[PDB]
Symmetry: D5
Subunit: 155 residues, 10 copies
Amino acid sequence: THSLHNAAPREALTDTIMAAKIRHNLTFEALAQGTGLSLAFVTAALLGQHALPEPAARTVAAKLGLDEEAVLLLQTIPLRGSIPGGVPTDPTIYRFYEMLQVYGSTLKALVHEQFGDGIISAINFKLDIKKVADPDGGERAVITLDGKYLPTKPF
Amino acid sequence: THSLHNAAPREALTDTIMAAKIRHNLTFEALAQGTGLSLAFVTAALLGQHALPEPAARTVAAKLGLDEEAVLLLQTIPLRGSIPGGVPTDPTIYRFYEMLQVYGSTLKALVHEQFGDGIISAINFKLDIKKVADPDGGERAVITLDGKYLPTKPF
Amino acid sequence: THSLHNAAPREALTDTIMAAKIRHNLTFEALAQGTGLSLAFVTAALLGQHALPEPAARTVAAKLGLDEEAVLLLQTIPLRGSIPGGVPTDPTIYRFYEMLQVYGSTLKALVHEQFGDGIISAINFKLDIKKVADPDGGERAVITLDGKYLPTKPF
Amino acid sequence: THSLHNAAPREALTDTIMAAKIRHNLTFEALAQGTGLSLAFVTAALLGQHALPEPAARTVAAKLGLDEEAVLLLQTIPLRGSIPGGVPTDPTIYRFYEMLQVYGSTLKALVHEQFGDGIISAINFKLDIKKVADPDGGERAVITLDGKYLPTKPF
Amino acid sequence: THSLHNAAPREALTDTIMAAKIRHNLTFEALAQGTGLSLAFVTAALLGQHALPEPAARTVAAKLGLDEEAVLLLQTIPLRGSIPGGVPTDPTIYRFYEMLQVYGSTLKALVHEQFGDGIISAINFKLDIKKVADPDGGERAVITLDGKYLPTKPF
Amino acid sequence: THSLHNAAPREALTDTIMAAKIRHNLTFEALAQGTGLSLAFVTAALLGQHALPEPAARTVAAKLGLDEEAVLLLQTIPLRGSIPGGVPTDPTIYRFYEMLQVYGSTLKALVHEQFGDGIISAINFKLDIKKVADPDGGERAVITLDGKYLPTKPF
Amino acid sequence: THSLHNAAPREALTDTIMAAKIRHNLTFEALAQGTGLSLAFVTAALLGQHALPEPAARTVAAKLGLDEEAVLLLQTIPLRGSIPGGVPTDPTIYRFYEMLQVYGSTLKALVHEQFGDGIISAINFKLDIKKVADPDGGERAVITLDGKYLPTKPF
Amino acid sequence: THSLHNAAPREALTDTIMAAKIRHNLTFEALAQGTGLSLAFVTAALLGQHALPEPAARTVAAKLGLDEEAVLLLQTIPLRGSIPGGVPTDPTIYRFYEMLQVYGSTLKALVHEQFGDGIISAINFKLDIKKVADPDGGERAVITLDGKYLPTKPF
Amino acid sequence: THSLHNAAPREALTDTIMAAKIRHNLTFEALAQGTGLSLAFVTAALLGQHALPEPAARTVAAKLGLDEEAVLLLQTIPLRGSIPGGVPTDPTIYRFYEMLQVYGSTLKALVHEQFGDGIISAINFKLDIKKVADPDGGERAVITLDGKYLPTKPF
Amino acid sequence: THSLHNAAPREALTDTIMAAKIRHNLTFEALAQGTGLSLAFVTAALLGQHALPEPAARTVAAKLGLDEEAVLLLQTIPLRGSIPGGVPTDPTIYRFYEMLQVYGSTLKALVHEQFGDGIISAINFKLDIKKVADPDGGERAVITLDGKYLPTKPF
Ligand SMILES: [Cl-]
Ligand SMILES: [Cl-]
Ligand SMILES: [Cl-]
Ligand SMILES: [Cl-]
Ligand SMILES: [Cl-]
Ligand SMILES: [Cl-]
Ligand SMILES: [Cl-]
Ligand SMILES: [Cl-]
Ligand SMILES: [Cl-]
Ligand SMILES: [Cl-]
């Protein structure tokens, strides 16, 4: 399928997609329903980080009232990267960067202990966010990272 | 409780802990047994990212045959940061950084939609790594991030 | 609530809000009057770092004569970050950066001493600037940082 | 008075001071008693960010059992800078950096409105940390920045 | 007085001021003449680094034929910073950066010796450049930095 | 003359010179006295930024009691650079960096207006710091930069 | 198997391995012989980028005459990353960086055209360098990258 | 032949080439047919990294229906560099960067042993991507780097 | 003469000059004839790095058919810097950067040995590139750097 | 021939060779005499940037009275890079960095005009420095860069 070499074309669509989302007062849950795909995937595709299959591109473009160029651009493989500069300053995103700072060594250590030499894939990967109640009062986020284990074996 | 201003004292302890861990053929699962704490927490403390309560610090130092200077240093608040330079190069750790790069915009968007203005905490936070079988043959990692939702409320 | 993925929409609004503020010869204290919120909060929201509740958004848009697009953008959750590049060059802002450079270690030491292992929140946080007279002649600024203590508790 | 051109001599002194503090189980509040100086100043001086007058240098060296070369090194004007790289990774220190990221524009705007063109000094400056109770249960930190206003006037 | 939150408005004004300056074949000496202010101040203000009082702002705007948004923009407190990126590449500007690279240690050492612990202010500051003859034939620049000494006193 | 290829040899010499300076309780004015050279030059040479002529090198080395290596190292051409990282964090040095940030564009403009296309030299350069009294009470520093104008002429 | 959290221990082993290799006048061809593994793998392991299985670890340590702390370190999973700073300066290594700079966009474009959305793995990956004769007189290197195609499929 | 000083003119041409490529649903293999050049070269030229000879430039411009300015721009030598910032974030491109990070030291060591002191050229260089089947199911990419060995010989 | 504070005005002129150069099939050798200046100087001036004498500015703009706003801009002293970011990615430019990396220490050593303490000027400087035949077949570039020696003499 | 993976071994050798050169009061001209190689090559090799053939290594080790470890280390292929950080701060080296900043674009333009698409090699490269008198008094350096033209030819 067709791929994009830079991020500028998908950044403009995301600014157009978000404009329609705010003006029509739509949610990402509403946009992803009837597409057959997960919430995290469809939202990422709208933010220019994934390619939508052709039916989902038409389903989302109908809800937002998007052009036919918008349906074509939503199906293209993007140049991924959502944090300009690599390190964010926005507090909501930074907390996930901070988690990586404290538990980065720990994740590597436990992956090599429980799985072995290799990586936990970010491509053969599924992401899910779930809202749960805190037994001590309040709400909690339970973000799940599901990656296939790729071993590094000697050659 | 006592805090450390630099990371050098805990880096020396971590290099001593790792040397003992290899010579005694110990696992992080074996070091965490009988401490009452989760694997991710105890491992992070050994890697210089957390302070262990005095009972847990004494259990791991006994298994590793460490001095009493090791149990006291294990109980001090460290200067956190496990990734030198913020951005990793090691493939095992980098994959988690890549997850942040693609789904950073997606995580913020869905947190503000499902929770509202605020953050998902990295302090009121739990980490878990679980090994599961992949239906297509092979293994998968199910990393769970459980953080408290802290709202941004007007003042 | 609706969230913004980039800063460009709120940076344009800030230029429009500030242009109206100068043209109406208004102060941030006058714009903050009758909103129920603190001066530091409303000013930050006008500069694109916070979301205003709708009654406060309508009071400021009425004083400045802004359209209904402006009240909607003022209520959206922004992508926070007011210093482009993280490190300021403007002397007024840098002095606050310099305070962090000298007393950064000192703040951590005393936070861990008086409170314990954890953080002083920047989300459960209040800011106040007060003008007081200097006894050697002149005036002084008394900026107050009021943050909730979040402990790091083992898991 | 004598100044140091690099930070290495004072970093070694701080590492010995912290070692003595941990082994004898002393407090920064205990170390600052009988010096006549504030907690924030003496703590910064022990962390290599300020020069102590000789009575304070001798009082702290007696409590920690330091040699005469430590009393002399505590009195020299240091090369200030406590956060290596300018941007911290430790969560406790970062929260103060995050405050600067959100309210940096706000602090400058309100300084120019309440005071005028100029700066709030970091040299004619006092710092204070106070522990207070949160009405929702728990504790809060009340950090105070007290700086002299220096105006920028035409010449 | 009114302050600006970003540098973009003053960068555009500087581009118009410089364009008008070339077309009218005027000097910074001619533009600053009859304003009562020093050459370094008015030139810095025209380059977006200072606020002009309205009598000075109108005399310079009349000479260049600037619009009425420019006279108001010339009177606002800007977001200071004239070297994009902090370190210049242009040889004329770099030479002053290089002077700092070699004599930075010397300036700190001699200020603490001749004045004491503290700084030489950059806000309570006057700048002047004077052309003088070189005894071996040719010209020399005599740049004068006149800053108030602010001491660092214990608190 | 003999040159040094790295900065490590002169960085070690500077630390010994500064330690010796404190133990003899000498000032940079006392060390430069009877050398025939200016205070700023001799101070810079001791701080590893300049080469001393042998008569001056012996006069200063006798006062500090330096080895015979220091006498040769003081006469060798060093690898210049006194601010590690290019941008200082120490407040005393930064104020001079801030002067460069505000008046960098202004200095280039006035150099090209009063002198023409070219630079103000940092090699054919003289530096002097003088203490003067402030009519508003207090003291002031009058730092003078005297550089020869090198024109850029077509080739 | 045991993994390392930092690179410092393997860099010391690598310099000792290289010291022994030069001192004993050994080749990388000889060190990889009798291990059953490819030249590219064993050489990478000696440079701290891979873990050797114990039979290979003893054959290489016997040829260099290394202790038992070396065979244990040679079998540990390292913290990978051979170019300090990410970008090399040595011309031999840089030429490979330049290949990435020119053909980076082309590799992404052709991978998405010939394979589809996804990546070419660097973990399920083999490297080979082969010397072949250049028909224009001279020699050529034929470096082969053999990576598994991992698709990004919707979830 | 004509050279370009910046990448913007070729970046716009690449944006037009890609837009036309999507609308006619053409492949890079289809664009390269009948030009006599390799797939990797022609794709690189369209992505702004190479100059096309006039016959190839016209065959590709006819297929996309481009004007004569596009055929002239396709023949100019560009300012090479396809990864903005040197280090990519897109997963597909980063995998090749990671290959460089792990085997960079290995490539240099083995190049000096098998070839000698010198480089493997990135200019006298050919690139090829080949799709082959993975015996354990799936597909694999076989990217081949063919560079001339240039020795560094004394002068 | 008139100076520019930013590079943006001259970057647009360079883009127009290059477009006219390509459209008229002109060379830098043809543009530099009849100005009396060297090829390297005029070419640099067209690329925004030098100010052209007023007669030369008219001839080059006449040859390219540019308006007079361009020759007026061609006579302005620019903000120099032709490599955005300091380090190039284009291979042709990088090779000259690589020369600096290998022989930078060597140039300083030999300059201080043959000339003495000081610099080789980049302002009192001439550049020439000459095409010569390689005795072993092929062509060679002989770039000549002619800089005045400026001594560092004590003051 | 043996290659080095890091620069530390050659940095130590360079410090001993330079010490011996001063202690024997020798010049780089004297050390290069009787080696058959050019001044720039032998000087670069002593500064850790080139490998000397063993006859040249033995004449230089004999003149400086070095052990056998020096003769072996001078013949090893180093990890090249003489400017730590890529960008120098020492004025003598920076002037050559500044030359590249101004004339970088000009060199690429004239190389593509006089030679064509390709590079001027830094491996098939000669460096020479010659001292000439300035006609109006003073001395000049005439640095000559002699690089082979390597064309980029389509494949
Ligand atoms: Cl992956
Ligand atoms: Cl948090
Ligand atoms: Cl927080
Ligand atoms: Cl201040
Ligand atoms: Cl100041
Ligand atoms: Cl100079
Ligand atoms: Cl992979
Ligand atoms: Cl090459
Ligand atoms: Cl110069
Ligand atoms: Cl080359």
